[PDB]
Design a protein around this ligand. Structure first.
Ligand SMILES: [Zn+2]
Ligand SMILES: [Zn+2]
Ligand SMILES: [Zn+2]
Ligand SMILES: [Zn+2]
Ligand SMILES: [Zn+2]
Ligand SMILES: [Zn+2]
Lengths: 242, 83, 135, 242
């Protein structure tokens, strides 16, 4: 049978911490009451309606002397070309050989898993009579995150700082993907240039299969200048001297 | 026949037969070479002409009163014109 | 369209406290690339294979002088009776007029709800061309 | 005849001020001594060497039993297939019907002309017997300029300023494409943000055919922060208060 592909939307926190989620899927299963045979041997009859074709040709007049032949799925066998009396299949499928069942799959998203990574559930796809079921393949879709951008195992963020912080040193705090508060300290007497990047080592994403190893966090600094007229002209001399 | 049956597919396995007036004889069922009729009608046996009728409305005429111009309607081959 | 019925298994604690749960369902949606038309007007062709029937009659010999005629869904149009070139529909449906999409429904189970109670999501069932979706 | 295309490399100053330049080109002209006839009527003889083919097949042995046939241009008629005795053409062409002459073209580059603009000299290409000459087409190629980048009729430049200049106002001078010194003044109490753009109106490129109208000059400001440790920590408080 055909494999079923489903996108699983995951956050950066889900990918960092790991996540177990329950996915509800509706799939075709072989009808438990007739084991797909549709019905008993000799219960399966040619649909009289479409004469086994699955489809009926309906004639719609558009104008006198203009008829449109439309092919419609046959109402009496729903396209199957066969009819099975309810008593021979069950009061479930309806000569269809399958029933829609709701299955809950438990999905494990491991630490450090990547965008586009596949989680396969073997033989979990749609069942059909005389067909071995395909797989359900979940495709991991990473959601955009407001603070962090992921590059492989590394994380990138933009942090806004004032001119005073950029020149005189600073301390700031942010929330990481595990919910820890990280305190970043930059010593006085070192300058942060506008757009410059600094690194916080080991505060990136965990490696897949090796969650003890992590990438790095790169912080791009956006240096905010003070507004128009922030200082009296008389004090510009004192600033120049410094 | 004057008409052609054109088949329009609506979907694979749904065909609509539409009757269209035949492009080649404009519904007449016959064709006359231009040289045999003229460069006017076109095997049509008639031409559209613009006629000016002078209409006299007499004093005291009533709403719904009829003014008839005899034989002034459309001409057709082998047909005496209406009014 | 037909309504889709799904059993939602709930515990007594879920029914007592109330519960919000996310249900992932796969449904047929109209193909965004051809708006169900399947393809452009005149892109829809009769399947040559089954001559518009959706099905092919395959002859299986059981023994010399015993042939079984089996009706199989036509491989070339997957039962539709029509074929649409990929370029006329998209590289998605495949002349099918629909695509399987995964939708997440947020389901609210209120306090005191009963066994057999129905929660309806209107128009959320399978879409088909020229058919208003069921619930 | 075929048109001759020549790239003319022009600077922004050339395009702003206008430029007259002399271009020396070598072209084929009809031989003044035989008027292309090659020679007198009956002076033109089939080349005996190549029997009128212009080419000779030379056999080079590569190994015994391996011969390479190479087609070479015929030495005796230089590919023409004909030979004209020197006395019948002149001591110039040599039965060639043309001579290489050096022509100087005066090229006018007007104010506001654009990259890729064509200057055509009609009938100035190579002459051949019984062929009307093609044109010489000069294609203007704008050279990169160290300070200014041109966009249509507008000019762009990057100007570096200190943090003090960005906050307290500044005055600077630059040399324009006409060689004028432009003094740009920015008033005190207005801030220049890093990477912000300002405009000096009417200091762009002149419009082609309308050199009284000019585009604008856009100045991107690159704000230079002071280096690491530029101020004593004790003075950081005084800076914060301002
Ligand atoms: Zn069944
Ligand atoms: Zn049927
Ligand atoms: Zn489609
Ligand atoms: Zn088919
Ligand atoms: Zn000569
Ligand atoms: Zn020769």
């Amino acid at each position: 049978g055909e494999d079923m592909m489903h996108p699983l939307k995951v956050s950066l926190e889900d990918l960092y911490n790991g996540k177990t989620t329950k996915l509800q899927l509706s799939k075709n299963v072989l009808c438990s009451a007739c084991s797909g045979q549709g019905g008993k041997s000799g219960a399966v009859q040619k649909c009289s309606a479409c004469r086994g074709r699955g489809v009926r040709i309906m004639i719609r007049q558009l104008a006198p002397g203009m008829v449109q032949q439309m092919q419609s799925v046959c109402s009496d066998c729903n396209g199957e070309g066969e009819v099975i009396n309810e008593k021979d299949r069950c009061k479930k499928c309806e000569g269809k050989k399958v029933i829609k069942e709701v299955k809950i799959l438990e999905v494990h998203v491991d630490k450090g898993m990547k965008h586009g990574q596949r989680i396969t559930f073997t033989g979990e796809a749609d069942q059909a009579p005389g067909v071995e079921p395909g797989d359900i393949v979940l495709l991991l879709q990473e959601k955009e995150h407001e603070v962090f951008q992921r590059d492989g195992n590394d994380l990138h963020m933009t942090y806004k700082i004032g001119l005073v912080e950029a020149l005189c040193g600073f301390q700031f705090t942010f929330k990481h993907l595990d919910g820890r508060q990280i305190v970043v300290k930059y010593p006085p007497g070192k300058v942060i240039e506008p757009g410059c990047v600094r690194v916080v080592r080991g505060e990136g994403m965990p490696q897949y299969r090796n969650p003890f190893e992590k990438g790095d966090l790169y912080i791009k600094f956006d240096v905010q200048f003070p507004e128009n007229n922030w200082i009296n002209p008389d004090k510009l001399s004192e600033l120049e001297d410094l």
